[PDB]
Amino acid sequence: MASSCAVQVKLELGHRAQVRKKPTVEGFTHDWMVFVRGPEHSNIQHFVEKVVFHLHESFPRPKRVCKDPPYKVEESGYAGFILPIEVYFKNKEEPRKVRFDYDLFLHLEGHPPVNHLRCEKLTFNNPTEDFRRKLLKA
């Protein structure tokens, strides 16, 4: 055909962390929350099948799957780590997913609490009509 298409979607990855007033019985000093979302409340569920958060092996059931929004994990712990996040798409064509190695860093006690936002742009060259339609609803 004469025509060609490039579709771009915006994803916001982020996390917040605070030192607890009292640590847990396991010795967890921090509460944190990590998320994947669309910018400005945009509904990425139109094209996102699921988000998988791969937590550190020290956590129980470390593969945390969010099939619906909000795509987030709320936890307590004692240290930060690299947290692989997989965003699966509602498609039957490649790419089926994208991976981000998310930097789930925690600040030291007596430092300001963490509140981080990471901006990612996905580009899809010539997606299927069905997948294009899902992307442009978001």
Binding site: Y78, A79, G80, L106, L108
Partner: peptide
């Protein structure tokens, strides 16, 4: 691999 958990950026 091991000892990847840490504090600070």
């Amino acid at each position: 691999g091991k000892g990847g958990k840490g504090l600070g950026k």
